[PDB]
Structures are given as C-alpha cells and as structure tokens.
Amino acid sequence: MLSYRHSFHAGNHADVLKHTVQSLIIESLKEKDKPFLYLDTHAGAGRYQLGSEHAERTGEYLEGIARIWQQDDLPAELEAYINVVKHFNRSGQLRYYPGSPLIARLLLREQDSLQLTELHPSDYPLLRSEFQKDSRARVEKADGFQQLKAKLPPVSRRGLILIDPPYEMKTDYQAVVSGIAEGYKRFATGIYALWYPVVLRQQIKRMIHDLEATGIRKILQIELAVLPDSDRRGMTASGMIVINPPWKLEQQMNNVLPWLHSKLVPAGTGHATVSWIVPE
Numbered sequence: 001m002l003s004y005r006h007s008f009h010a011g012n013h014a015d016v017l018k019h020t021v022q023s024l025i026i027e028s029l030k031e032k033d034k035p036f037l038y039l040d041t042h043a044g045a046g047r048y049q050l051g052s053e054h055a056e057r058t059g060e061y062l063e064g065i066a067r068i069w070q071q072d073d074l075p076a077e078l079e080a081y082i083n084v085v086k087h088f089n090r091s092g093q094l095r096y097y098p099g100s101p102l103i104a105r106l107l108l109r110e111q112d113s114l115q116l117t118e119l120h121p122s123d124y125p126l127l128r129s130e131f132q133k134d135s136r137a138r139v140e141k142a143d144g145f146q147q148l149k150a151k152l153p154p155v156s157r158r159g160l161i162l163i164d165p166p167y168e169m170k171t172d173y174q175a176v177v178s179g180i181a182e183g184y185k186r187f188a189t190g191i192y193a194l195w196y197p198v199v200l201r202q203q204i205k206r207m208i209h210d211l212e213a214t215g216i217r218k219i220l221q222i223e224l225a226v227l228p229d230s231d232r233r234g235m236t237a238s239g240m241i242v243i244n245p246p247w248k249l250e251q252q253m254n255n256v257l258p259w260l261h262s263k264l265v266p267a268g269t270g271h272a273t274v275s276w277i278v279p280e
C-alpha cells in the first residue's frame, strides 16, 4: 500500500518521455491567452534528489535525463523542458530532477491553475512545501482518480490532465480507463495524458482495448522502448496516451523521437513510435 517510491526511477527514460510530452502540451495551451488548469492526479513529491540512495541504487537517471540535458544539438522541441531541469541544477551538475508538478509550476503563467493530489505521507508534505505562497496551486492529500470526478470541468474550461500512476496495484490498469471515461464525460474537450509502463505487453493491449471501448475518439499513442518486449526484463518501454492531443503534437513527436531514442538508447535496441489508437 503506497510502497512505491518514485525517487528510484526519477529522471529515467520514461520520465524523459513523459515530461517531454507534458511540456509540449503545456506550451501549446499557452498559445491562447485564456487561463487553463493543470491537473496532476498522482503528483509525487515535486522534485527528486538524484544523489539519494534510492536513485543511485538503480541509477536510472544516468540512462535517462543525463544523456540529453547537456547535448549541444538539443532539438528545439525539448528546450522548455530542459530549461526547467537546468533551473534546478544551476551548478551544471545533475543533482535534482523536477517532477511533473514543478515542470508545470515553471511553465504555467500567472493566470493558470494547478490542482495536485498525492497520498503518500512522505511525499505529500514535500509537495505542499513546494507550493507555499503559490496561490495558483491547490495541493491535496486525496485519491487522484477521484479528482477526475470532483475537479472537472475546470472553471477555465481549458486544461491538461496528467494521469501518472505507479501501477503498483494491478487495478490501476482498469482505474486509468474508468477514470478517463469519468473525466471525459465531465470535460470532453480536456487534454488527457496517460502514462503507462510496459512490463507485460499483455496488460497494455487489454488497457488499450478498454480505452477503445469507451468510444472516445482522437487518441494518440507515443511509445519509447529501450528494449524489445519481454516477460522477464522488468520495464522495457513506456508511453504516453493522449486524448485530444494539440494540433502540433504528432508532428513534434515525429520531429523529436528519433533523436530522443538515439540518445537514450545508444545501442539502438527497442523502438519509438507515434500512432493513432483512435482517429478523429
């Protein structure tokens, strides 16, 4: 029960993909002056210490953010995200990694809003202190999936909903789908970004089945695999499923995925794809 700790994984290849997509979506939303909501259902601590014992045990950040953040030929699509990372590592050494709530905190504007939830008794107080005196943000110790009912639609009528669970309980694979259907019912023009791991390809196929069955349209799938699928290799890939993706997102991902994959996976194994689960 809440035994998952994101500090082991912070800044790994999956975070790099996830936060790339988050930032691009946010930048798109800012192309209109009107305010929007950023909703993070499973928000985490806010930032992560990479020198921590948990990070270095896996050291997964070494094969993720570390391989891209100082590249001189960084694609223009990655600048906003990487400039947030640099902000938290101004010494030029990689010591801290910003979670989704801090990427949002620095990319959102004065008029925009954040609604964040985190249940874990270590991570919640940490997240709360990240947002003291930032009156744009509401931070609660509550179930994230329940927010898709309670907080939608936003008063602004615009927004990004990031659903990023740890999949520690297998039930998450169903809960993400029913959660999205509940959210969509309330706010059908929302942008929903669902992160998923590939541990067993089986469970992803089924999840995508259930998503298709909701009848929701306009669903984009972005996946980066560092290894081919297996049933004995832990997490070999991760992806972002985006409902109502912004107009440029498909092209931006086509622009940046080959570079990303080349940097994250120098051996060239696995794959990286962008395609539609359900077209318009």
Ligand SMILES: C[S@@+](CC[C@H](N)C(=O)[O-])C[C@H]1O[C@@H](n2cnc3c(N)ncnc32)[C@H](O)[C@@H]1O
Residues within 6 Å of the ligand: 002, 004, 006, 018, 040, 041, 042, 043, 044, 045, 098, 099, 100, 101, 117, 118, 119, 120, 123, 142, 143, 144, 145, 164, 165, 166
């Ligand atoms: C991996 S993290 C997400 C990190 C964050 N979104 C980021 O990008 O930096 C998943 C988190 O969800 C929390 N959690 C698990 N179940 C939850 C629930 N039902 N509601 C809210 N938070 C949950 C965990 O404690 C953990 O911090």
